[PDB]
Amino acid sequence: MIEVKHLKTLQALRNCGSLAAAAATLHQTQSALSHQFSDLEQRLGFRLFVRKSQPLRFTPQGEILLQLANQVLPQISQALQACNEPQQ
């Protein structure tokens, strides 16, 4: 199942361009990041990015979930900022 951490990690793959560079940004190891994705791909039933691809390419399902991330993550951020607004 898709979690918020998977959506941010998908953004790191696009923003950093490789599994190793994104792992360095997310303070994780490269294998642990690869293990998290294949673990997610197994439960979802489809792959998120092209295996062995260099440069790394997303699958159509990965592009869909990346666009999902670009939409949900700013909304969660704005919601938590409103929760911490000096009011209510």
DSSP per-residue codes, 7-24: HHHHHHHHHHSSHHHHHH
Of the two residues 55 and 86, which places its CB atom closer to Mg ion in the complex?
55
Residues 50 and 68: their CA atoms lie apart, in Å, by 19
DSSP per-residue codes, 71-87: HHHHHHHHHHHHHTSS-
Residue 76 interacts with a second copy (CB under 8 A)?
yes
Residue 79 interacts with a second copy (CB under 8 A)?
yes
Contact residues toward a second copy (CB under 8 A) are: 1-5, 44-46, 59-61, 64-65, 67-68, 71-72, 75-76, 79-80, 82-84, 88
Contact residues toward Mg ion (CB under 5 A) are: 37-38
